[PDB]
Every structure is written in C-alpha cells, then in structure tokens.
Amino acid sequence: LPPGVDALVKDGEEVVKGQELAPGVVSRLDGVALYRFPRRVRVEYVKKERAGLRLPLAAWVEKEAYKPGEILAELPEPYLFRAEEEGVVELKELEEGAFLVLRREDEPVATYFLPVGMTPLVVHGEIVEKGQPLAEAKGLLRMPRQVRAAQVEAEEEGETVYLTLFLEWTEPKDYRVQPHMNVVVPEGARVEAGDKIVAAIDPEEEVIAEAEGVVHLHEPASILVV
Amino acid sequence: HEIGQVPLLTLEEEVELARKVEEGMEAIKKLSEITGLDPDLIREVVRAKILGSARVRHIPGLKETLDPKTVEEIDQKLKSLPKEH
DNA sequence: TGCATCAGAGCCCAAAA
DNA sequence: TATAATGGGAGCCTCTGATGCA
C-alpha cells in the first residue's frame, strides 16, 4: 500500500477478484483480506453522561429519546441559550455539536449540550455569570450525527422546557504504532480500562486502553488476500 | 532463481517474524513445565506438524524414536490442554 | 509419417617419462 | 555472538543413433 494511503476494505472482509483494495491497489483474487501491520490504531471511547438544555416550549418536539440526526426543535426566531450557573467554561467540541461544562471551585456545577444549529458564543476557559448567553440557536436544531440521546426528561418552567438528557457518544483518539510494536487486539474488540492494545519493546512504549471503547485499524502497510 | 522467489522482508515483517520466533521458544519452555515433557521432544513434535508429514525422521537427541505414532500420541496430550494452556 | 539436429561415441604399438 | 550488510561468473573431427519437428 502506497505510504499514507488508507484502505477501502476492512480486516476480515470477503473480497472478489478485481475488487479495489486501495486507491491504487486492486486485488487479483477472491478470498479473505487481512491487514498487514496497521500503522495507526483509532480507539472510539464510550462516554455516557448527563447534560441539560433549555428551549422555547413552542419550538420543541416532544419525544422520549432522540436518535442521531433527529430534529430536536425548530425555532421560529433566533434564541439565546443562557447559562443557569456561574463558572469557568470548559468547551469540549465533538465532530458536530458541542459540550459545555461550567465549573467553580474545581467541581463541575453544570453540563450543557449544544446540538447542531447552536453556535457557542463563549470560548474555552471563559468566565460566565448566571443568565449570560452561551450559545445561539437559529432555525432547526437537531442531534449531531455522532451523539445519541438515550433518555429525555422534561420539566416545564414558564415558556421554556429544560431537558435533562442522558447522552451516549464516542470520542476518537489516534495511536501511532512503530515498526517494533505489534497490535495485540483485534478489529472491533471490546476493551476495559487497563487492557493493552499495542505492545512494544519496553513498558513505557506500550499503548494501554484508557477506558471502555471499540478499536478500529487503519493505514496498513500492505493487505494480504488469502 | 529459487532464492529470488522469497521476497525480502520489510523492517516490520522482519521484526514480526523474529518476534514470533522468540515468543514461540518461550512457549515451548512453558509447555515443558506444564507437561513435564522434554523441551526438545516437544519442539520436534511442534516442528513436525508445521513442516508436515513430508519430513518425519528419528532425531539423534530424542530419547524415543520419532514416528507418526508418537507425534500423534504426544500431539494428543497437547490437544488435551485447557484453553489457557 | 520422413527429415533435421544434437549428444555421445570413438580416434596405432611398443618404447620414454 | 549485535552499525548494516540480502541473486555467480565465464568460453576454441566424424559416425551413429534418439529425439524433437513439418
């Protein structure tokens, strides 16, 4: 495989003769494709948290859970989502959508969820006071493609809804594998905290899994069709 | 010409094979411990099955004559091991 | 099937050195 | 027993019979 080019087919995949394995590489025979020494291991970590949101009651669609991509609300006019606590802002941006975490004396006092269609008006590490706008919400706002909503609780106060969302999403982290390291974990494996993913000559060069996640192999040196 | 049909190893491939070879020898030592069997005798049985039925012969160091009967017998003790062993 | 091509088979004795 | 090393190197007559070819 040409250096840096990533494969189309996945480790284990049945392949027909003539099928294209890589941008410039075409398989000459049918059989099972096997990745030859993966250069980059990507671990998608499983995170399950609790985050809040407040919306105009007329703008929100009632549901018990929200699947990825689903429309959460549709706003007739732009809405300023405001902080309900004072704190310093920890901004954590996902692929699409964002997380916002207010903390005062260390201990996080709030976790808010900004879906797509909501542009943060604050930056990481910004001091906010109760009531100042965190994010603008304009038009249709929906769940991001990479993040789900397992449970949706709703309290109604005045003209707004406050959603307490139980959210599940995966955060990618890339690890580089050197020629002297071997991947000891299969594609699609389930790992807990402490499980070894890549091994190396010495202990400080090993890659140990930080928490729960699933493993994906990318950019192999070559593909072996057997 | 025959030499030229085996591609040269990449640094990765070279390290991988060497690594697997070292790990395999450590395994044979370990398999010796578990079974209480001669490490060399075990090694010839392991090696016999990889090279195939083609090459089976008496080994000067082995105490027992090495023939398909004994490698099947010994292989069956190996196939009687618990999953982690 | 009848013709060509090549591999392999030989190339004096005795004397001497 | 440990830098890395990865594909060689050369040459001076006639008959008979089997073998490989239109």
Swiss-Prot record, chain A:
Family: Belongs to the RNA polymerase beta' chain family.
Function, in words: DNA-dependent RNA polymerase catalyzes the transcription of DNA into RNA using the four ribonucleoside triphosphates as substrates.
Oligomeric and partner information: The RNAP catalytic core consists of 2 alpha, 1 beta, 1 beta' and 1 omega subunit. When a sigma factor is associated with the core the holoenzyme is formed, which can initiate transcription.
Name the UniProt record assigns to this protein: DNA-directed RNA polymerase subunit beta'
Biological classification of the source: Bacteria, Thermotogati, Deinococcota, Deinococci, Thermales
This protein's encoding gene: rpoC
UniProtKB/Swiss-Prot annotation, chain B:
Domain of life: Bacteria
Compartments, as annotated in UniProt: Cytoplasm
Region (Sigma-70 factor domain-1): 1-28
Domain comment (free text): Contains 4 domains, connected by flexible linkers. In the active conformation, the domains are in an extended conformation, each making extensive interactions with the RNA polymerase catalytic core.
Record-stated family: Belongs to the sigma-70 factor family. RpoD/SigA subfamily.
Subunit structure: Interacts transiently with the RNA polymerase catalytic core formed by RpoA, RpoB, RpoC and RpoZ (2 alpha, 1 beta, 1 beta' and 1 omega subunit) to form the RNA polymerase holoenzyme that can initiate transcription.
Role of this protein: Sigma factors are initiation factors that promote the attachment of RNA polymerase to specific initiation sites and are then released. This sigma factor is the primary sigma factor during exponential growth.
Protein name per the record: RNA polymerase sigma factor SigA
